[PDB]
Amino acid sequence: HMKIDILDKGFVELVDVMGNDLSAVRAARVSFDDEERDRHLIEYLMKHGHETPFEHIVFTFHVKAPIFVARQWFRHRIASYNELSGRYSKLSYEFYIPSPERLEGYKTTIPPERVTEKISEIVDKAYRTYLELIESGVPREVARIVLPLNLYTRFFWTVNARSLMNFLNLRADSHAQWEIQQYALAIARIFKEKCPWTFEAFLKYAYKGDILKEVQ
Amino acid sequence: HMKIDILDKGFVELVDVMGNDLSAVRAARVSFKDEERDRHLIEYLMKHGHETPFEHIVFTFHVKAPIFVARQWFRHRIASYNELSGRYSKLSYEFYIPSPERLEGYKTTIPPERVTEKISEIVDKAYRTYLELIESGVPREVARIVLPLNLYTRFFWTVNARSLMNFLNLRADSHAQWEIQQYALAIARIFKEKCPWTFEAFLKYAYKGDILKEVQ
Amino acid sequence: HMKIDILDKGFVELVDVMGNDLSAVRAARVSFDMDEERDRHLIEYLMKHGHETPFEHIVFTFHVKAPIFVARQWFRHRIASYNELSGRYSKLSYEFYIPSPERLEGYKTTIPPERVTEKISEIVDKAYRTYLELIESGVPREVARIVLPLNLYTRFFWTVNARSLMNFLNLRADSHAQWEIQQYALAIARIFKEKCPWTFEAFLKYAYKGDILKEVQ
Amino acid sequence: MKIDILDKGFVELVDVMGNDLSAVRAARVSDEERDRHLIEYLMKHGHETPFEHIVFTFHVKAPIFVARQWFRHRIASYNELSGRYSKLSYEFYIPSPERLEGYKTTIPPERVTEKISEIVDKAYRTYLELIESGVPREVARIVLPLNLYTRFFWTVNARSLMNFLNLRADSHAQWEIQQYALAIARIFKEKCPWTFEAFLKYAYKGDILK
Numbered sequence: 001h002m003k004i005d006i007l008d009k010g011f012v013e014l015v016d017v018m019g020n021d022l023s024a025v026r027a028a029r030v031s032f033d034d035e036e037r038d039r040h041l042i043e044y045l046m047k048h049g050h051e052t053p054f055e056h057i058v059f060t061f062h063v064k065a066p067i068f069v070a071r072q073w074f075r076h077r078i079a080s081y082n083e084l085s086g087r088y089s090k091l092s093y094e095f096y097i098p099s100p101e102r103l104e105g106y107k108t109t110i111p112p113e114r115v116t117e118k119i120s121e122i123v124d125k126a127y128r129t130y131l132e133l134i135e136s137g138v139p140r141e142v143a144r145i146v147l148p149l150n151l152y153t154r155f156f157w158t159v160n161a162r163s164l165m166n167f168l169n170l171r172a173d174s175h176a177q178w179e180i181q182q183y184a185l186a187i188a189r190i191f192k193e194k195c196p197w198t199f200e201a202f203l204k205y206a207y208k209g210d211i212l213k214e215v216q
Numbered sequence: 217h218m219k220i221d222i223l224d225k226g227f228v229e230l231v232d233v234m235g236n237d238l239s240a241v242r243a244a245r246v247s248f249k250d251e252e253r254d255r256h257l258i259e260y261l262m263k264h265g266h267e268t269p270f271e272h273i274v275f276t277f278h279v280k281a282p283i284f285v286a287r288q289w290f291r292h293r294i295a296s297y298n299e300l301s302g303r304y305s306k307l308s309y310e311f312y313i314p315s316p317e318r319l320e321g322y323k324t325t326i327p328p329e330r331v332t333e334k335i336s337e338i339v340d341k342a343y344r345t346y347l348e349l350i351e352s353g354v355p356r357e358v359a360r361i362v363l364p365l366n367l368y369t370r371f372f373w374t375v376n377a378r379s380l381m382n383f384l385n386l387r388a389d390s391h392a393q394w395e396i397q398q399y400a401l402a403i404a405r406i407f408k409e410k411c412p413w414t415f416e417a418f419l420k421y422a423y424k425g426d427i428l429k430e431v432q
Numbered sequence: 433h434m435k436i437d438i439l440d441k442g443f444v445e446l447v448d449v450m451g452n453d454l455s456a457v458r459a460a461r462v463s464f465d466m467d468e469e470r471d472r473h474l475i476e477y478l479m480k481h482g483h484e485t486p487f488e489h490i491v492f493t494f495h496v497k498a499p500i501f502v503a504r505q506w507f508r509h510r511i512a513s514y515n516e517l518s519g520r521y522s523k524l525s526y527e528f529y530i531p532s533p534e535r536l537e538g539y540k541t542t543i544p545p546e547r548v549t550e551k552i553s554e555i556v557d558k559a560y561r562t563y564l565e566l567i568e569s570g571v572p573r574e575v576a577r578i579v580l581p582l583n584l585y586t587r588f589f590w591t592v593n594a595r596s597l598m599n600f601l602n603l604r605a606d607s608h609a610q611w612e613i614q615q616y617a618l619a620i621a622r623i624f625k626e627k628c629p630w631t632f633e634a635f636l637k638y639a640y641k642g643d644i645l646k647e648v649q
Numbered sequence: 650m651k652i653d654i655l656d657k658g659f660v661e662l663v664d665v666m667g668n669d670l671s672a673v674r675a676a677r678v679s680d681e682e683r684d685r686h687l688i689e690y691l692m693k694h695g696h697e698t699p700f701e702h703i704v705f706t707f708h709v710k711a712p713i714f715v716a717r718q719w720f721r722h723r724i725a726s727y728n729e730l731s732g733r734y735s736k737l738s739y740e741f742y743i744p745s746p747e748r749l750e751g752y753k754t755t756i757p758p759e760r761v762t763e764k765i766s767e768i769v770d771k772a773y774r775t776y777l778e779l780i781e782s783g784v785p786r787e788v789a790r791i792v793l794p795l796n797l798y799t800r801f802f803w804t805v806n807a808r809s810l811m812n813f814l815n816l817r818a819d820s821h822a823q824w825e826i827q828q829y830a831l832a833i834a835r836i837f838k839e840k841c842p843w844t845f846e847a848f849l850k851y852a853y854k855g856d857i858l859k
């Protein structure tokens with residue numbers, strides 16, 4: 001299974017896939033079974049906006065992302081989600097602590113290392129308060145509300161190539177938060193590995209973002 | 217490939233599938249095996265209305281059906297479709313001619329065999345008019361409008377188990393037209409073969425229709 | 433109620449609408465927490481930068497009477513709500529779309545365009561008479577109707593938001609789409625322009641991918 | 650219509666399209682007593698598509714943990730407060746001691762309320778300190794707790810709204826979202842009384858509304 005590590009404790013793991021570039025070719029021509037002619041069709045469908053044949057290629061991912069990242073991701077309605085229940089599921093209680101390198105470019109009054117320290121400080125205080133409430137008898141659903149937005153969560157993502165290509169135009173772009181951009185780059189990498197023709201054609205004719213045309 | 221013939225010239229063919237019953241188990245637990253425990257979870261998710269884990273099992277079918285059946289089918293929006301272009305495809309023109317046995321139960325002034333003959337008569341007249349217009353230079357998109365609603369079409373249907381179970385509840389039921397009931401029975405057969413635990417649980421706790429609890 | 437007649441016997445009628453151009457402004461203004469000129473400037477900004485979600489808050493309900501072959505192309509738009517006349521039970525008017533000889537202008541035909549119109553009328557009369565003969569003899573509606581041509585008129589209700597409506601106009605109000613549905617999309621664009629003038633103007637200026645709306649008034 | 654939820658939250662009706670007859674007009678394509686009888690017929694026989702023609706727009710102010718459960722309902726339109734570009738107001742959900750009634754706790758319920766206020770003040774002060782020192786909003790905000798209030802616009806049709814009520818206006822859903830769901834049901838009852846009544850009588854799967 002393809003697994004790309006993202007941020008300090010996160011990942012993107014490919015669980016399953018249905019079809020390849022030819023799944024889109026079969027659907028566009030409508031018949032159940034030439035390499036150059038088939039790849040030429042992929043480029044034709046892409047450059048002319050014939051997006052429906054690409055809905056026949058489906059992916060299942062296992063993502064471990066911080067809640068603030070998952071909140072931006074889960075806004076993509078044309079997909080299937082299954083996340084860990086904060087009310088009942090036994091979470092690992094891992095948190096995203098940005099490295100000082102995340103603050104490179106911004107001029108700060110305090111050192112970037114002090115920002116990293118202040119984030120660690122408040123997640124430890126919040127987590128200790130949570131355990132103290134849990135130990136005292138407060139139900140999980142009430143005690144968990146004190147936990148920060150950088151807390152790690154795990155989910156299953158079933159998405160078709162069409163909706164995956166929309167996620168890439170929006171999330172694999174400089175206007176999206178750096179944290180989600182990283183997760184989208186891993187999604188693009190897994191997509192390129194499984195559908196090389198559809199990915200290449202996408203970057204050539206349909207891709208609206210910027211970071212995928214700059215980063216290898 | 218599983219292929220079930222429906223009506224006089226139609227079929228339902230399984231193109232591809234992603235996952236099995238365990239795909240729904242993995243998605244519900246949020247983790248990438250105990251037969252009794254896994255089957256007990258499928259039954260728990262089904263009886264308590266936890267339907268989202270079943271969206272992680274996806275199917276691709278190749279269906280050949282009359283346009284009046286396709287019109288009823290394509291009303292199911294939570295799916296992916298790709299049909300033959302009536303405007304450009306050099307399609308095989310075949311029509312659904314109901315057998316006299318289709319009219320069994322209804323009291324008719326003319327014999328059921330005469331109904332079958334009258335349908336064949338008018339489809340031949342309509343098809344001959346179409347070819348005459350096509351030969352005379354009329355574009356396909358205009359000449360085709362004279363063809364009857366029993367004209368066979370071909371399409372590719374990508375649907376997840378949840379939306380497939382909604383289709384079964386509605387189309388594999390006596391209230392739906394006899395022609396689509398037949399197509400839904402073939403869908404249920406391919407679904408049972410690939411996801412036996414999910415199909416058994418669905419019939420036991422969620423299935424709202426009638427014909428699937430009567431027909432084997 | 434706005435009603436635009438399409439083809440020989442069809443129409444597009446506006447049943448209801450929710451919101452206007454300022455509905456999209458109110459929905460966008462919640463993001464960055466906080467005037468006609470300023471609110472029109474926002475619509476144009478959202479449109480040119482691909483911020484499409486605020487436009488989902490403007491919803492329309494239409495009543496369309498179109499030939500089945502047109503409805504088949506329309507109903508492919510899944511991000512909408514539909515409700516059509518039941519062919520199995522509903523009492524249809526039994527009206528058919530007969531193209532005028534002017535529809536065949538441009539194409540070189542061996543037979544005159546007037547003969548094409550006559551041949552279409554000929555076969556719809558034959559099919560309709562066969563249908564009534566089966567209906568009178570006791571054949572159930574669901575079986576007897578299968579002989580009727582694709583040019584037969586149907587009626588439906590269409591509930592669609594401005595975002596999905598703008599996808600429809602992109603695809604159907606374009607030269608690559610069949611002339612029949614282009615006509616229906618032009619009336620949709622007309623009703624959309626009348627209710628959402630700022631959104632429609634911004635749409636043609638920055639987001640519209642088709643061709644006929646930038647040429648036809 | 651505005652219904653206040655929890656300590657600082659609300660559900661406000663922005664706009665609505667149609668009423669009970671919008672579903673009647675949409676169904677009749679396929680008299681008060683005869684129209685109401687149709688509503689009950691469509692509901693008891695599972696004819697749900699005519700109800701998609703009644704659409705609502707709400708303005709909701711709810712904590713992030715409630716919004717996370719709400720936003721899982723994909724058959725709807727959402728528009729939320731950025732966070733990356735918006736000005737973070739000191740608005741967090743502090744449960745009252747009455748929220749812990751029923752559970753036996755080692756510390757008093759009033760001390761739980763105090764400990765929640767204590768940690769939100771610490772997290773909000775840390776946030777302002779990072780913001781003042783030059784840390785961008787999108788990075789500094791990650792320290793804020795899940796009880797932080799957010800605002801969003803919700804455009805949903807009656808069919809998807811009735812699915813939301815079957816799931817969220819039920820004892821199995823968290824008590825906080827149940828409260829919001831009761832406000833969604835109240836506004837729905839006021840605008841579509843026939844649809845709500847028939848829904849309660851034949852289609853409603855939950856428990857708290859009955």
Ligand SMILES: Cc1cc2c(cc1C)N(C[C@H](O)[C@H](O)[C@H](O)COP(=O)(O)OP(=O)(O)OC[C@H]1O[C@@H](n3cnc4c(N)ncnc43)[C@H](O)[C@@H]1O)c1[nH]c(=O)[nH]c(=O)c1N2C=O
Nearest residue numbers: 075076077078170175176463485488511595596728729731
């Ligand atoms: C750089 C940036 C900034 C922000 C945001 C995003 C980005 C990249 N987003 C999220 C997007 O709005 C959108 O949710 C997401 O891009 C998914 O984007 P999305 O495009 O809505 O994805 P989808 O999976 O829901 O659906 C895929 C396609 O399906 C169609 N669709 C689906 N449901 C529909 C329906 N109901 N009606 C009509 N069409 C519908 C539509 O054509 C869409 O492209 C914000 N959202 C918000 O509310 N306030 C904000 O300030 C921001 N902003 C701050 O982070």
Ligand SMILES: Cc1cc2c(cc1C)N(C[C@H](O)[C@H](O)[C@H](O)COP(=O)(O)OP(=O)(O)OC[C@H]1O[C@@H](n3cnc4c(N)ncnc43)[C@H](O)[C@@H]1O)c1[nH]c(=O)[nH]c(=O)c1N2C=O
Nearest residue numbers: 079082083085268271294378379721722723724816821822
């Ligand atoms: C009491 C309780 C506990 C938990 C949860 C919920 C509740 C109430 N939920 C969230 C539900 O899934 C939620 O109701 C759903 O997302 C929206 O619930 P939902 O019912 O899927 O609502 P929708 O608006 O997305 O869509 C409305 C309808 O549209 C159809 N649909 C939409 N998209 C589809 C598609 N892609 N494929 C097929 N059909 C699709 C489908 O028929 C659905 O009924 C959990 N989810 C999770 O992953 N782990 C968990 O432990 C939990 N659990 C704790 O949090």
Ligand SMILES: Cc1cc2c(cc1C)N(C[C@H](O)[C@H](O)[C@H](O)COP(=O)(O)OP(=O)(O)OC[C@H]1O[C@@H](n3cnc4c(N)ncnc43)[C@H](O)[C@@H]1O)c1[nH]c(=O)[nH]c(=O)c1N2C=O
Nearest residue numbers: 052055162163295297298299301508509510511603608609
């Ligand atoms: C000129 C022309 C020619 C032809 C066709 C059309 C035209 C204009 N179309 C129809 C399109 O394929 C399509 O259905 C629709 O027009 C676009 O219709 P569409 O763009 O898919 O619109 P929508 O309303 O279903 O959904 C709105 C948005 O929602 C998203 N979406 C919705 N459901 C989704 C999902 N499940 N997965 C991923 N994304 C999904 C997606 O981003 C989409 O833009 C054909 N279809 C076919 O099967 N064979 C053919 O030969 C032809 N062709 C000959 O007539």
Ligand SMILES: Cc1cc2c(cc1C)N(C[C@H](O)[C@H](O)[C@H](O)COP(=O)(O)OP(=O)(O)OC[C@H]1O[C@@H](n3cnc4c(N)ncnc43)[C@H](O)[C@@H]1O)c1[nH]c(=O)[nH]c(=O)c1N2
Nearest residue numbers: 291292293294386391392512515516518679698701808809
């Ligand atoms: C016996 C019988 C008879 C008829 C019909 C069906 C059957 C089974 N229909 C068709 C019917 O109205 C419906 O369109 C199809 O059965 C598809 O059902 P869904 O919408 O549930 O599936 P679909 O696949 O489209 O969606 C699945 C689920 O997604 C949700 N959903 C999808 N899009 C949504 C949206 N925009 N808003 C809210 N929820 C949404 C719903 O929860 C739905 O259950 C009909 N139709 C007609 O027009 N006239 C008629 O007379 C009949 N008669």
